[PDB]
């Protein structure tokens, strides 16, 4: 089995200089990217960038872009966030995921279970509702939208409390292995949605969508999906 770990978070003073690991196992470790995707306490997601395979070139965000340095060692089969003058907004949990070896696959497979960090012009994704309560048995439908057209390269993970996200779907419509039937999804262009005909317990999670048409990789802000009694009023925002 895939296994991803990350290590070296610790709390650290605003102004120092920390890095990160992704021990990586159970695969061949040069076929795959690696990427870093950090969270914000009771925030999204936010991609921090990724190495490559086969050309090992890193790609950032803008928004850490010339600050943080991603590396690769293929003889230790760990990739390395190194984060530099520290402050406030990179109080996160951080994560490195696998990107599968395609060329238009930059979505994540795999992801560690994260180290937390605490300091003492793209394509934006918008999701609705941010907030929504439903019941068990439901049909619940959330809607992703692209502020322009991505083809079908949309992704989406059902995120649980203190658990990394897990991809759900891919491709706007390619169901992941080991992801049940009451999930679907649909689209192209700029409207994307993803549906679960019927609501079991372990179904009451955050769903974020993601974007891979274009660099930067871009997360929406998140839909997060709360339990209600059948008797209760039905609410989403």
């Known amino acids: 089995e895939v296994q991803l770990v990350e290590s070296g978070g610790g709390l650290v003073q605003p102004g120092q200089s920390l890095k990160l690991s992704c021990k990586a196992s159970?695969?061949?470790?040069?076929?795959?990217?690696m990427h870093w995707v950090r969270q914000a306490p009771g925030k999204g997601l936010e991609w921090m960038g990724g190495i490559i395979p086969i050309f090992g070139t890193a790609n950032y965000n803008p928004s850490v872009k010339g600050r943080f340095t991603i590396s690769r060692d293929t003889s230790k089969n760990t990739a390395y966030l190194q984060l530099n003058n520290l402050r406030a907004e990179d109080t996160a949990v951080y994560y490195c995921?696998?990107?599968?070896?395609?060329?238009?696959?930059?979505?994540?497979?795999?992801w560690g279970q994260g180290t937390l960090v605490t300091v003492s012009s793209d394509i934006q994704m918008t999701q609705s509702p941010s907030l929504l309560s439903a019941s068990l048995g439901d049909r619940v439908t959330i809607t992703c939208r692209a502020s322009?057209?991505?083809?079908?390269?949309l992704a989406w993970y059902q995120q649980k409390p203190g658990q990394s996200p897990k991809l759900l779907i891919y491709?706007?419509?390619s169901r992941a292995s080991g992801v049940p039937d009451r999930f679907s999804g649909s689209g192209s262009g700029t409207d994307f949605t993803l549906t679960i005909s019927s609501l079991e317990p372990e179904d009451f999670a955050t769903y974020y969508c993601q974007q891979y048409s274009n660099y930067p990789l871009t997360f929406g802000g998140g839909t997060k999906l709360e339990i209600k009694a059948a008797a209760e009023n039905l609410y989403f925002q």
């Open positions: 159970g695969y061949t470790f040069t076929s795959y990217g």
């Open positions: 995921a696998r990107a599968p070896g395609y060329s238009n696959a930059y979505y994540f497979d795999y």
């Open positions: 322009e057209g991505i083809y079908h390269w």
């Open positions: 491709k706007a419509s």
